[PDB]
Amino acid sequence: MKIDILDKGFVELVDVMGNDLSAVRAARVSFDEERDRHLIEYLMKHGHETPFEHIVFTFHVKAPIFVARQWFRHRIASYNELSGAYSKLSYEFYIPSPERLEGYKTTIPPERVTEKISEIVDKAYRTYLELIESGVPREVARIVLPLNLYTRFFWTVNARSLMNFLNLRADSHAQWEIQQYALAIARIFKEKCPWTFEAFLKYAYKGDILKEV
Amino acid sequence: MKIDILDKGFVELVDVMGNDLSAVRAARVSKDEERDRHLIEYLMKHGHETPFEHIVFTFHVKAPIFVARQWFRHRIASYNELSGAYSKLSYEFYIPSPERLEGYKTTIPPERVTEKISEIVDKAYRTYLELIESGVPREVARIVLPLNLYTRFFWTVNARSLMNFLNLRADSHAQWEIQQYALAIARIFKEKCPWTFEAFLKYAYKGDILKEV
Amino acid sequence: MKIDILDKGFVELVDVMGNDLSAVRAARVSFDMLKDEERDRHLIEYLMKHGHETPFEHIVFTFHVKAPIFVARQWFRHRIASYNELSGAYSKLSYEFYIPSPERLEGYKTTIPPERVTEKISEIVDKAYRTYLELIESGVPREVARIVLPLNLYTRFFWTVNARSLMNFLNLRADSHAQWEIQQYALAIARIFKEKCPWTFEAFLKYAYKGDILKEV
Amino acid sequence: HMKIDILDKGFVELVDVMGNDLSAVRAARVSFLKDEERDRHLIEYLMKHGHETPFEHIVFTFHVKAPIFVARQWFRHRIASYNELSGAYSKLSYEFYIPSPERLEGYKTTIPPERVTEKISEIVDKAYRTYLELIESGVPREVARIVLPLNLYTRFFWTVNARSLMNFLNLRADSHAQWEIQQYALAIARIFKEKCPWTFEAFLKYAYKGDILK
Ligand SMILES: Cc1cc2nc3c(=O)[nH]c(=O)nc-3n(C[C@H](O)[C@H](O)[C@H](O)COP(=O)(O)OP(=O)(O)OC[C@H]3O[C@@H](n4cnc5c(N)ncnc54)[C@H](O)[C@@H]3O)c2cc1C
Ligand SMILES: Cc1cc2nc3c(=O)[nH]c(=O)nc-3n(C[C@H](O)[C@H](O)[C@H](O)COP(=O)(O)OP(=O)(O)OC[C@H]3O[C@@H](n4cnc5c(N)ncnc54)[C@H](O)[C@@H]3O)c2cc1C
Ligand SMILES: Cc1cc2nc3c(=O)[nH]c(=O)nc-3n(C[C@H](O)[C@H](O)[C@H](O)COP(=O)(O)OP(=O)(O)OC[C@H]3O[C@@H](n4cnc5c(N)ncnc54)[C@H](O)[C@@H]3O)c2cc1C
Ligand SMILES: Cc1cc2nc3c(=O)[nH]c(=O)nc-3n(C[C@H](O)[C@H](O)[C@H](O)COP(=O)(O)OP(=O)(O)OC[C@H]3O[C@@H](n4cnc5c(N)ncnc54)[C@H](O)[C@@H]3O)c2cc1C
Ligand SMILES: O=c1ccn([C@H]2C[C@H](O)[C@@H](COP(=O)(O)O)O2)c(=O)[nH]1
Ligand SMILES: O=c1ccn([C@H]2C[C@H](O)[C@@H](COP(=O)(O)O)O2)c(=O)[nH]1
Ligand SMILES: O=c1ccn([C@H]2C[C@H](O)[C@@H](COP(=O)(O)O)O2)c(=O)[nH]1
Ligand SMILES: O=c1ccn([C@H]2C[C@H](O)[C@@H](COP(=O)(O)O)O2)c(=O)[nH]1
């Protein structure tokens, strides 16, 4: 499963340990369908969250640095990110669509906003390449690159922390760009743990956007 | 995979996410056996351990409470343990064998030590049952039960935290009982992640027992 | 500041970093900004009401706690904290056990009088402790000998915990679903917290606290 | 109180601290305070055998001003608490890290180092002015700021215990880390040394894995 986000971003599922029944086994402390689904709803509605820690996902995410900086604030998880030190990278940037400013009253037309952003990233990127060409080390030259540069990372996270992420990021108080990523994460979560996801929405989910879409 | 430990304990593998290549994929943010095995060694040698967080195990453990108390000090992991509140329990107890007092200079035969331990355990257990029958709530009556009572738990842990656990517990400074569990944990780890386990022993393992066995 | 709990237990405050204003400082950096008492106290309520918890991680406590192992076994489940505990492997354990009072059984139909429940618990404790001492005297290593001791043995530990994790602890343990014994420890923890961080504590009770017992102690 | 300037406009400021060397001694001893010689000796013993949990009871709060590319590396340290200035919620000041010509010493460049410095300040100036224009035209801040470069300074509070701080030093007070973060780590180390002299000395002698604090 892969879902494209923004103009060049994505979220894709790399691996998963378990399914809804992994939470059921942990709660019962037993290795050996209505009953089980009812236990999931019961745990969720009574705040018994620790069984959900035994379901784990690994995602591969392509996102602009400003979005990754917000994302990497979630400390109960594991991350590995691309570094120019290890690997030569592709350099792509998030250019908002004009519809991103819809609902805002700007004195510049939205399409011109889009153009001004593309222009400044083109100039920044070209300054970077000239510095590289002239023998400036990469770790110094790259400091002129803008916050909308795309990066990629692996993210390994258990369902309990993932639910916290959805509470905070699949919510209208979160910035629009990361909301879009959170929606893709939720869609994958729902696919792999349908019972847990339905119970979370019904009983524990604190945000607004997953109830309207 | 299930390994018997002590007189009634065990370590059982429940699930695993990933294998050695999960660490390699996360490190590169992406098979070539020679180069992949070499990367794993490189990471281990230079202390870049975050890629090993993307391998995850779930175990099912049966152990005495005094061993579990030591084990549960490892905070970077997930636990769910049996409680009498939700499950009726079997009541079994770890009685050391005379060989456990191999080469301790004692004034009483080792076999008699075993006998005295069995006696007091039996009497405590009888008392527990008398209190229960007489209407005392379980949460109060159980306070007479000794530290060698067996419990069971699920343990979900990533390879980085598992390696820390091995460093500290598969070691002669740890108590003999938890060493035996750690050896079983090491055996399962080695089976599922042979390249990581060998690199660990070669470059990062600080303990003194896993290179002996 | 030391509060006695159960028959021989306690919670004692060892140290504290920060106060209510630590969280105000941390919150304000978001907007590139302390102000004054009314606005700063108002911010603490705002944060608590809207679920902004991270600013409270900058308030930290160290407690010294003496408690029965069955209580410590529950307490030590709180992983977002630091612990150091008395070792039964390394030290010779004192004759200190939690013997509940007869009132502990108030509310329960027993076929034995509660005073007799109390005496039966004491008897088994004494037999177990006697056995332990005799094993030790025979040269049985301490870490093996102690396995016969009951779960009501008292242990001691240091606990360092920030206010956000401490509030999670209060939600879960200052609550009627927790065992009565740990409730008593959580009431003491709450009293110390209220003493050092009155604004945070008050706003927590008013907007964020999910438990029941603190709203009426 | 304690404040150390870093780079052209950055700093590390110590806001608060809980505990001292004796806090770790107290914490360790509960397993089994005495005098200064045996207590100093215990700290070295703990460091030597990798008994690190006692050091978690020593806690610092720092106030840090650093460029975003530095903060990006710093915030990978999960065993800590952060609160940071927001470009979504606040209008950002004209504060950017412009490296000095000396930052390029030992690298052979086809432009003089001086000109590299000028080229960097030019691109940041253009980027910042674009940001301001967008804000003035009514673009929300959270979108306007996406054109700003990685050398924009941010500010944050960092609360961290001595054990995690030693891990940070091992990794960042080290020649394999980027020069800019090394400079911050040197400042953290100087503060640590001042507040926990016995722990810091024991750390250097027995546990420190890096190469610049010596
Ligand atoms: C709408 C919005 C606006 C924001 N604005 C800002 C801002 O202006 N500035 C800013 O710095 N950040 C901001 N954040 C980030 C926010 O403060 C958190 O850093 C982020 O949401 C991660 O949340 P978390 O701590 O719950 O997740 P994780 O770090 O993944 O933690 C998961 C859970 O574990 C616990 N936990 C983990 N570590 C600790 C610890 N050390 N102490 C106590 N408990 C812990 C908590 O229970 C937490 O819920 C914002 C976030 C949102 C959603
Ligand atoms: C031989 C032996 C004797 C022991 N004796 C005692 C004793 O007498 N008394 C006693 O109380 N304990 C004792 N312990 C327990 C020991 O102090 C640790 O609690 C246990 O080994 C878990 O180690 P940990 O913190 O590395 O593991 P985890 O808790 O799983 O943490 C893993 C890693 O994450 C980091 N970490 C996690 N949380 C934090 C945090 N809050 N701050 C900083 N870093 C963090 C550390 O890098 C740590 O290595 C003993 C352990 C051993 C092996
Ligand atoms: C009334 C009651 C009954 C209980 N019964 C049982 C039982 O029968 N069996 C049993 O095993 N336990 C039981 N527990 C213990 C319970 O499951 C938790 O272990 C304990 O309450 C600690 O809560 P915590 O995880 O919120 O706290 P902490 O471990 O301190 O964690 C604090 C917060 O950080 C986050 N967090 C920390 N680590 C992780 C992680 N690895 N993944 C995701 N998020 C994380 C969560 O947001 C969490 O709320 C019971 C507790 C109570 C109060
Ligand atoms: C020279 C250098 C180059 C680097 N290059 C890259 C790169 O190319 N790509 C990249 O993504 N990152 C890179 N990093 C970042 C690095 O991978 C770590 O994220 C960073 O050093 C923080 O280290 P930490 O995990 O030990 O610290 P913290 O996250 O503060 O953790 C402290 C300790 O707690 C334990 N711990 C915490 N959380 C967990 C968990 N979830 N599971 C198991 N144990 C845990 C570990 O014992 C750890 O040592 C680099 C760092 C350095 C210094
Ligand atoms: O919605 C937000 C706003 C801020 N932050 C965190 C991420 C950064 O560490 C810092 C500033 O982020 P910006 O507001 O500049 O995106 O605060 C978030 O995580 N989410
Ligand atoms: O080898 C040890 C010794 C102690 N402890 C921790 C576990 C307990 O929380 C506390 C006391 O354990 P005992 O020494 O009583 O087993 O210290 C361990 O984890 N391992
Ligand atoms: O109220 C409770 C009940 C259980 N547990 C945890 C502690 C043990 O790890 C396990 C069993 O505890 P008891 O039910 O035996 O107290 O579950 C708690 O933390 N609190
Ligand atoms: O020295 C380094 C190199 C990389 N990273 C981490 C931070 C980012 O999450 C990712 C890429 O960082 P840069 O190489 O772009 O700085 O790896 C560090 O923390 N320190």
Chain B residue nearest residue A151, CA to CA: B29
Which of D172, D153, D193 lies closest to D64, judged by CA? D153
Residue with tokens 């039966």: C120
- CATH 3.30.200.20 for domain D1-214: no
- Over the range B77-115, which residues count as b (16 or more CB within 10 Å of their CB) and which as e? bbbbbbeeeeeeeeebbbbbeeebbeeeebebebeebbe
User: Which chains sit next to D, with 3 or more Cβ pairs under 8 A?
Assistant: A, C
Residue with tokens 């059921």: A24
**Ligand closest to CA B77:** 3
Q: Give the separation between CA D176 and CA D104, rounded to whole angstroms.
A: 17
Q: Give the separation between CA D65 and CA B11, rounded to whole angstroms.
A: 49
Task: Please give the biggest Cα pair distance in chain B.
Answer: 68
- Cα B80 to chain centroid distance, Å, stands at 14
Atom of ligand 2 nearest to the CA of C84: 11
Pocket test for ligand 2, best of B162, B165, B168, B173 (most atoms within 8 A of CB): B168
Tokens standing for residue B162: 């598992």
- Cα C114 to chain centroid distance, Å, stands at 27
Calculate helix-pair angle for B176-192, B159-169, nearest 10 degrees. Answer: 140
Inform me whether the C-beta atom of residue C138 falls under 8 Å from chain B C-beta atoms: yes
Q: What is the CATH number of domain C1-217?
A: 3.30.1360.170
Q: Give the separation between CA C134 and CA C140, rounded to whole angstroms.
A: 9
Q: Give the separation between CA D154 and CA D75, rounded to whole angstroms.
A: 12
With contact defined as beta carbons under 8 Å apart, do C58 and C18 qualify? yes
Q: Give the separation between CA C148 and CA C129, rounded to whole angstroms.
A: 8
Enter the DSSP assignment of D90. Answer: S
Resolution (A): 1.9
Angle at D165 between CA D163 and CA D169, to 5 degrees: 120
Enter the DSSP assignment of D56. Answer: G
What Å distances lie between residue D138 and B65, B111, D143, CA to CA? 63, 85, 11
With contact defined as beta carbons under 8 Å apart, do D59 and D199 qualify? no
Q: Give the separation between CA D73 and CA D178, rounded to whole angstroms.
A: 9
Q: How many CA atoms lie within 13 A of C207 on its CB side?
A: 18
Q: Give the separation between CA A26 and CA C101, rounded to whole angstroms.
A: 36
Give the helix/strand (H/E) hosting A191. helix A176-192
Tell me which method was used to determine the 3D structure. Answer: X-ray
**Can you tell me whether residue D132 is helix, strand or coil?**
helix
Domain positions in chain D: 1-214
Inform me whether the C-beta atom of residue C134 falls under 8 Å from chain B C-beta atoms: yes
Mutation target vs C (from D23, D42, D61; most C CBs, 10 A cutoff): D61
Give the helix/strand (H/E) hosting A164. helix A159-169
**Can you tell me whether residue D183 is helix, strand or coil?**
helix
Facing residue for C86 by CB, picked from D31, D53, D82: D31
Q: Give the separation between CA C164 and CA C186, rounded to whole angstroms.
A: 15
**Can you tell me whether residue D57 is helix, strand or coil?**
helix
Which of A73, A90, A72 lies closest to A81, judged by CA? A72
The DSSP result for C109-154, as a single string, is --SS-HHHHHHHHHHHHHHHHHHHHHHHHTT--HHHHGGGSBTTBE
Q: Give the separation between CA A64 and CA A78, rounded to whole angstroms.
A: 18
- Cα B122 to chain centroid distance, Å, stands at 26
Residue C2 burial by Cβ neighbours in a 10 Å radius (0-12, 13-18, 19+): exposed
Q: Give the separation between CA A1 and CA A13, rounded to whole angstroms.
A: 6
| Chain A residues with beta carbon closer than 8 angstroms to that of D72 | 65, 69
Q: Give the separation between CA C157 and CA C91, rounded to whole angstroms.
A: 14
Question: Amino acid letter at B196?
Answer: T
Q: Give the separation between CA D204 and CA C90, rounded to whole angstroms.
A: 29
Mutation target vs A (from D146, D153, D164, D179; most A CBs, 10 A cutoff): D146
Is the Cβ atom of D72 under 6 angstroms away from ligand 8?
Answer: yes
The residues near C99 (Cβ < 8 Å, ≥ 6 apart) are C7, C118, C121, C122, C125, C152
Query: Which amino acids bring their CB within 6 angstroms of ligand 3?
Result: A 50, 53, 76, 158, 160-161; B 78-81, 83, 85-86; C 77-80, 165, 168, 172, 177-178
Task: Identify any residues that bridge with B63 across adjacent strands, giving them in sequence order.
Answer: B151
Sheet strand arrangement including B2-5 = B2-5, B9-17, B56-64, B150-158, B78-81
Instruction: List all residues of chain C from 38 to 77 with a beta carbon under 8 Å from chain B.
Output: 68-70, 73, 76-77
Enter the DSSP assignment of A212. Answer: H
Tokens standing for residue C132: 């332990």
Chain A residue nearest residue B52, CA to CA: A78
Q: What's the length of chain A?
A: 213
Enter the DSSP assignment of A11. Answer: E
Enter the DSSP assignment of C97. Answer: B
What Å distances lie between residue B103 and B110, B112, C92, CA to CA? 10, 15, 21
Is B25 annotated as catalytic?
A: no
Which of C156, C147, C137, C132 lies closest to C66, judged by CA? C156
Angle at A76 between CA A71 and CA A77, to 5 degrees: 70
| Chain A residues with beta carbon closer than 8 angstroms to that of B22 | 15, 58
Enter the DSSP assignment of C175. Answer: S
Which of B154, A70, C98 lies closest to D72, judged by CA? A70
**Can you tell me whether residue D50 is helix, strand or coil?**
coil
**Beta carbons within 10 angstroms of residue B210's beta carbon:** 20
Tokens standing for residue C201: 């504590």
Q: Smallest CA–CA separation between D90 and chain A, in Å?
A: 14
Contact A136 D82 (CB under 8 A): no
Query: Which amino acids bring their CB within 6 angstroms of ligand 4?
Result: A 78-81, 83, 86; B 50, 53, 76, 158, 160-161; D 76-79, 164, 167, 171, 176-177
**Can you tell me whether residue D178 is helix, strand or coil?**
coil
The residues near A106 (Cβ < 8 Å, ≥ 6 apart) are A113, D137, D138, D139
Task: Identify any residues that bridge with B4 across adjacent strands, giving them in sequence order.
Answer: B10
E strand spans, chain D: 3-6, 10-18, 59-67, 81-84, 153-161
| Chain A residues with beta carbon closer than 8 angstroms to that of B15 | 17-18, 22
SS (HEC) of chain B: CEEEECCCEEEEEEEEECCHHHHHHHHHCCCCHHHHHHHHHHHHHCCCCHHHHHCEEEEEEEEEHHHHHHHCCCCCCEEEECCCCCCCCCCCECCCCHHHHCCCCCCCCHHHHHHHHHHHHHHHHHHHHHHHHCCCCHHHHHHHCECCEEEEEEEEEEHHHHHHHHHHHCCCCCCHHHHHHHHHHHHHHHHHCHHHHHHHHHHHCCCCCCCCC
- CATH 3.40.50.1820 for domain B1-213: no
Which of C118, A195, A29, D197 lies closest to B136, judged by CA? C118
Q: Give the separation between CA B154 and CA B68, rounded to whole angstroms.
A: 11
With contact defined as beta carbons under 8 Å apart, do B179 and B4 qualify? no
Question: Amino acid letter at B136?
Answer: V
Inform me whether the C-beta atom of residue D100 falls under 8 Å from chain C C-beta atoms: no
Q: Helices (DSSP H) in chain C: which residue ranges?
A: 20-28, 37-50, 69-75, 114-137, 142-145, 163-173, 180-196, 198-203
Which of C97, C117, C120 lies closest to C108, judged by CA? C117
